[model samples]
Target: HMSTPLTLIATITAAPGHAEALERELRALVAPSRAEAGCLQYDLHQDRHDSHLFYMIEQWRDDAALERHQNTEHFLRFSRGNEALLQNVKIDQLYRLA
Candidate 1:
């Protein structure tokens, strides 16, 4: 039997007055992430009602793919420099049920 894809929903909030920088970095993450192996989907979204709020909607082939993504150079760069631009982060892991 085939395994279900892993869905990762990440809620990212900008630090005070840091919306622009945060969005820039988040956008940069898209291309590299989507090019990686097993990256089924990688989309970045901004909240219509809240400019400071963003979301990364992603799908990976499995946990291993995600783990590999976490170690990539582009991802590492984002994580390293984002501390000042990010206020909060929340993640939810899921799989399709129907």
Candidate 2:
């Protein structure tokens, strides 16, 4: 059986004037990632005041499942190709305290 679910929050920013293109690439990851083996929640959001900023709130069944996602084809494509369009990508794994 899987261990405790893993929660992750990813913050991303597009290069100057690259918001639309970067958003498209990020949007492309949604469907495939959501359909993966242990995906519990995978949602993306654009910052209302900053078009170049985006966030992904994700949950996976366990660490192994999250690791598997990083190696998936769709994710690999983004990881390899997003450099030109991205300014930064930050991810944080969180544990509940309450």
Q: Each candidate: what lDDT?
A: 0.94, 0.91
Q: What's model 1's overall lDDT?
A: 0.94
Residue-wise lDDT of candidate 1 within 23-92, one digit each (tens)?
9999999999999999999999999998999999999998899999999999999988579888899999
**Clashing pairs in model 2, backbone N/Cα/C closer than 3 A:** none
lDDT string, candidate 2, 1-98, tens digits: 23567889999999999999999999999999999999999999999999999999999998888999999999999888679998888999975554
Candidate 1 differs from the real structure by a C-alpha RMSD in angstroms, to one decimal, of 1.5
TM-score, predicted candidate 1 vs. hidden true structure: 0.95
For this target, which candidate reaches the highest lDDT against the unseen true structure?
A: 1
Superposed by TM-score, candidate 2 places the C-alpha of residue 81 at a distance from the truth, in angstroms, of 2.1
Question: Residue 2 in candidate 2 has what lDDT?
Answer: 32
